[PDB]
Write a protein that binds this ligand. Sequence first.
Ligand SMILES: Nc1ncnc2[nH]cnc12
Length: 247
Amino acid sequence: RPIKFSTEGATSQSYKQFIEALRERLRGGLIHDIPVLPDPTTLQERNRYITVELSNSDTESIEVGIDVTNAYVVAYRAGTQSHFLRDAPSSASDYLFTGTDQHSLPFYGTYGDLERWAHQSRQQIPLGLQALTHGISFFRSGGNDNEEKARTLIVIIQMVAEAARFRYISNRVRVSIQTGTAFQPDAAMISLENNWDNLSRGVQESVQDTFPNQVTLTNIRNEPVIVDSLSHPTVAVLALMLFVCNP
Ligand SMILES: Nc1ncnc2[nH]cnc12
């Protein structure tokens, strides 16, 4: 029962509905009124991995497998063949795409390794409906180009997983789809991606609404904004937290 998103005639609303469905499946609870992913140590492995279907048409689609403990993309599938990130958890292949031939990709799923293999940083790689359409077609074609494999995963990871995590990012992608205008992730988006764990930890370890360790983000105007409390307006950007601790 994959959660589905189609690029064909995609709209602001259809993308929003996709992210909302993904967020609702990923949610394991609320901490300080903010959704949090499940604690991996008490999660049953049969409940750990979910699939998203990304389609360009009724006859051109791929699937991506997601670890609900951290919203990580750990694998993708085209037809009878699947491909797992080098650092996919051992159990991922026991539950995802088990009726396929499962291959191991040569790169880790980290931005560091993906950017290394793509020979491009996140800042350089366009996001938006055309980028996603192009990536779906590339994975469905089965092309062996590892540079484009890494670039394509950078696109999918941000338009699916980072979008699920951050309201700022889902909205930015929604605008791209609405307007038909591709975009490069801005410094605010990059800083959110880079600080998800730190923000999740700040919220969940907060004492009287104040973070034990402060978090430095960058704002839409390339200015650095310090976040140290639950009341910081930038905290409203968190749609899903990584589980760190119960408060
Ligand atoms: N593979 C991945 N999936 C989701 N978020 C990520 N952030 C960095 N790598 C990621």
